[PDB]
Design a protein around this nucleic acid. Structure first.
Ligand SMILES: [Zn+2]
Ligand SMILES: [Zn+2]
Lengths: 82, 97, 94, 144, 108, 54, 81, 96, 93, 105
DNA sequence: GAGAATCCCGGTGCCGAGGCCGCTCAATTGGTCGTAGACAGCTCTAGCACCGCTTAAACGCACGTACGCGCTGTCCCCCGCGTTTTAACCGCCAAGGGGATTACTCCCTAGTCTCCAGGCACGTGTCAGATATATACATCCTG
DNA sequence: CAGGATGTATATATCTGACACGTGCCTGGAGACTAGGGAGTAATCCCCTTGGCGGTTAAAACGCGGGGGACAGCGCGTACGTGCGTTTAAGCGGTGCTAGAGCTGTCTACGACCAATTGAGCGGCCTCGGCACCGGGATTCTC
């Protein structure tokens, strides 16, 4: 079983450089937990649809097209993966 | 000695990261996070590398958009420091919560 | 002269089963009809897309199960799936 | 406008007559006569043509068909001419005399890849001498 | 005289028309062919959802000392339930109004 | 004179490829006919939208 | 022909809308902004509705056409068929 | 006898949050709809039901926008909504 | 050997027409393919909905033109409709 | 045999578009001019996007079009940005912009 | 406590919802066949797992400085109210442009068959991008 | 303002590897043909829309006065960016395994379909009762 420590894998410098790309000047210290909570929610929403697509396909692995369809059904179409 | 005043390094980081297209998160911890999340929906699932890359691309784009919106909100609050109030406001307005 | 169709009768029957002593306005009935049509369209479209994705040509109970799981959130989806499975089981037994 | 363009082109043609080709109103319809250019199997032949100018000319290509029978892959029995500048590569900046020169060039070099009579293109590709001989026969038969 | 009238809904103990659902599916250009259990499952799902909405609306109406369900009652029932609110967050209901709430900052 | 109509240039329109023609002939042969340059085939559709918006 | 009908949306009407929205105090410049926003929204909806009608080849805009126009913008509306 | 400012505002907020009636005058709204529709096809005709549906959708949209802009104004730590608040709400919602 | 199909060849031809001396990366080609597929799906779905609304059974150029008007905005839609009408006219002729 | 695209002077495969239409179960029957119209529309859109991307690349002093160039071309054009407002492009990055407030005064 | 606003009990009608009456049109039954789908089996490709070495990224700490936050004066703009003004609204009635059906016909599209050619999977060379580095070049910052 | 500190884009070079290129092959596109049904067209009916009227009046507009709240300012604390020194997993790479993905081939349950039967719902027609209304008493919030 994979432990819950993986949420800490999204490092503070990684979040900081994401904010830098987004155009943020400076970041409060309380953000870094809010951001990973938001990321966890978003990933749960996408993966829930991906895995059910795979289950309906009766496969044991998750393909790229499953993720593409899951994103498409949420109005988040992704180009570059067929 | 030599000491850049605060802000200049932030501005040059903004310019640098707004000019490149590389991923900003580490592949291995992102994969571990994805596998941890997915194990509850169904155990012992396997993933394609392209699938993980697509997930990471989508997540990074979503976070960048959210950060742009929250920066706009913080500026609207007559500030320059992003704080979770701004993130919550942007999430609520965009109908995500 | 076009004989339009709606679900007013069945909606009324379900309402009588749930609340035996409650009326429903005419404009409310139209809202219920629109809601039923919207849900039907969503589920049917999702099932059709699933069948096309799996390179299939038949819409079966499994596709509708998956479409319901995709659309309805959480507890609502669980209860709906339970109800649909029970109905299909009873229909097969009959 | 279109009539103005026709009159201007007629005036320029009168001022700049070509060596062999000639055409004129017989305004929006012109009769064209071209001499079979030398160094070709059609050398010496006199070919007559009909020109039909569209109402939006020069912004649309004109309708021109051969009225003299000729042995050429890109020309059918009805006189139709398979020409890109007649169908796709038309430009309003073009002139009728340029079209005539292009026709002469195509007569000197048929395009077997996009012909109107496939048999003529077949003869052209399989036996150049046979194509030249039959083309000269047709030029003498109908254009002389 | 082939058999007594036993509708597929009666077989499944449903109230929605299984035959009508099947006809709509095969007439809706959704797929080349339609399976046997698909109309049954879809009718069951629709019946359950309508029952849920009607139950919530009836509770809201009885809480308002009224005996007839109205679009206001439907709007309140949808907004109050989190699941239905999320399902129909992009849905506008005529004569529905809004869920009555005021921000605490405005209150003195 | 217009490169096409040869009449006096009334509000002449200059292409980004440095080619110019009268506004009537321009609208007749580029705006609604070609979207390519009458002289050097320079396609101007995006330029056309940009200048139409302004 | 007619013009300047946008002023028909009165300041008290906008105020009632904001009150239903749960607004306690309203600035003086909100009204022109609301006029512009409503004009843009109505233009966007009516363009699609008119496109639907003229595709159907008739001169009358119908409730079903308006409903379709709203639906195609992710703004589903109930109570009109 | 005068009420303090904001009290009648709160009472009318409570009043309007409970009723389901339309808050815009039907005749000028219809005139506006026809005036806008003039720019696409002349001499068009409208069904009363179509106009009512348009009014319902417009009122719902404006109420939602006002909710969002009030939320933003509160976030700015003040109680008066302002055009900058409206612009922020619309920009975040992606309408512009 | 499931021979999969894309639009790479036609996209490259269009690129040659527009910029005769410019190349395109392989990954950009995949993005163009995804874009073409997405736009095609949008237009076809809208045309199908139009045909169903009008109780028709055939998709003609009318439905496609209306769907394009619904989807593409402003001058983009204007140019697209002009191109489609021109192509249909030329094909008929 | 002359292809329908050649007849229409297009580049996209009219036959392929027709086959996709009849296999997509969009309608029971398909008109003759619909594939032509759709192919023309797709060709025009691709041409527009490619022209913008090529201009972006030449402004960047490069000769190959990349997803970064595609993203720049889409975001810079208002019409295309509106059309593809909810589209994520892999390896696309973001349009470089800094709020003027953050700049020093 | 006084004044203004709000809910409810009470009798009434009246109009909008519930039950009745064909009958017909859609749901059902049964047979039948073409077939999409299920199952078994085989091959093998990509995902999973691990080792080891490098090091660039992550992490921890000091600081000081710029920013957030709180307080305070002010003041001007927004709310509440009243009087006046006006256009919405209701009722009513005339005119008709236009929406919905019917028939029919016919012209368009589906279907099949044959032919082939243009697109796909496959080698290639060659040519555009990266790396390295020494420049200019620009910018900050502290004087 | 200016020159050193310090990033930063560049011109040049060579590697290199990603893409434009020629090749064999195959299936999907084009074509001639016929049949059949979708719908384009005309004419028809009626009906819902437009326009108009006049009369009421509730709603909107204006203006006045007051107060509260947005705003500029100021002072103070603190926490976050910046840098430097210390870990440490990410990445590479490399290997080895195997399980699940993809495929082909067999077999068959099953859905489409047709013909006949029949009854459930649509339309209409009642009957009555849930609720809006008008009045007033009881209640409550604010100044
Ligand atoms: Zn001119
Ligand atoms: Zn030019």
């Amino acid at each position: 079983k994979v432990l819950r420590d993986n949420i800490q894998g999204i490092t503070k410098p990684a979040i900081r450089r994401l904010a830098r790309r987004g155009g943020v000047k400076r970041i409060s210290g309380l953000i870094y937990e809010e951001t990973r909570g938001v990321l966890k929610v978003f990933l749960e929403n996408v993966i829930r649809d991906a895995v059910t697509y795979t289950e309906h396909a009766k496969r044991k692995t998750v393909t790229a097209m499953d993720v593409v369809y899951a994103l498409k059904r949420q109005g988040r179409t992704l180009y570059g993966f067929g | 000695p030599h000491r850049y005043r605060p802000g200049t390094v932030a501005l040059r980081e903004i310019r640098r990261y707004q000019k490149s297209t590389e991923l900003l998160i580490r592949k291995l911890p992102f994969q571990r996070l994805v596998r941890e999340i997915a194990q509850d929906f169904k155990t012992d699932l396997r993933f394609q590398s392209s699938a993980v890359m697509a997930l990471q691309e989508a997540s990074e784009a979503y976070l960048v958009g959210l950060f742009e919106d929250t920066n706009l909100s913080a500026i609207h609050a007559k500030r320059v420091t992003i704080m979770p109030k701004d993130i919550q406001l942007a999430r609520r307005i965009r109908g995500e919560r | 002269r076009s004989r339009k169709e709606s679900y007013s009768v069945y909606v009324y029957k379900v309402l009588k089963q749930v609340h035996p002593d409650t009326g429903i306005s005419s404009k409310a009935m139209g809202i219920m009809n629109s809601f039923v049509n919207d849900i039907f369209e969503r589920i049917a479209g999702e099932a059709s897309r699933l069948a096309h994705y799996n390179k299939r040509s038949t819409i079966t109970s499994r596709e509708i199960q998956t479409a319901v799981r995709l659309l309805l959130p959480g507890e609502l989806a669980k209860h709906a799936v339970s109800e649909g499975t029970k109905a299909v089981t009873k229909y097969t037994s009959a | 406008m279109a009539l103005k363009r026709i009159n201007k082109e007629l005036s320029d043609l009168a001022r700049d007559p070509p060596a062999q080709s000639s055409a004129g109103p017989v305004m929006f319809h012109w009769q064209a006569t071209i001499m079979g250019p030398n160094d070709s199997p059609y050398q010496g032949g006199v070919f007559f043509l009909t020109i039909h100018f569209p109402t939006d000319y020069p912004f649309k290509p004109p309708k021109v068909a051969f009225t003299t029978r000729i042995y050429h892959p890109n020309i059918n029995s009805n006189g139709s001419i398979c020409l890109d500048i007649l169908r796709s590569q038309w430009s309003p900046a073009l002139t009728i005399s340029k079209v005539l020169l292009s026709i002469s060039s195509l007569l000197s070099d048929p395009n077997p890849d996009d012909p109107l009579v496939p048999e003529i293109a077949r003869i052209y590709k399989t036996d150049r001498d046979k194509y030249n001989r039959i083309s000269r026969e047709w030029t003498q038969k109908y254009a002389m | 005289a082939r058999a007594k009238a036993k509708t597929r809904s009666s077989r499944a103990g449903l109230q929605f028309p299984v035959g009508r659902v099947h006809r709509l599916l095969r007439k809706g250009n959704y797929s080349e062919r339609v399976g046997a259990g698909a109309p049954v499952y879809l009718a069951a799902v629709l019946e359950y959802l309508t029952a849920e909405i009607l139950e919530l609306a009836g509770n809201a109406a009885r809480d308002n000392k009224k005996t007839r369900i109205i679009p206001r009652h439907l709007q309140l029932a949808i907004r109050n339930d989190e699941e239905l609110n999320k399902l129909l967050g992009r849905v506008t209901i005529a004569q529905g109004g809004v869920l009555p709430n005021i921000q605490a900052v405005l209150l003195p | 004179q217009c490169g096409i109509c040869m009449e006096i240039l009334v509000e002449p329109v200059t292409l980004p490829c440095n080619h110019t023609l009268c506004k009537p002939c321009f609208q007749s042969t580029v705006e609604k006919a070609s979207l390519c340059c009458p002289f050097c085939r320079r396609r101007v559709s995006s330029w056309t939208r940009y200048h139409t918006r302004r």
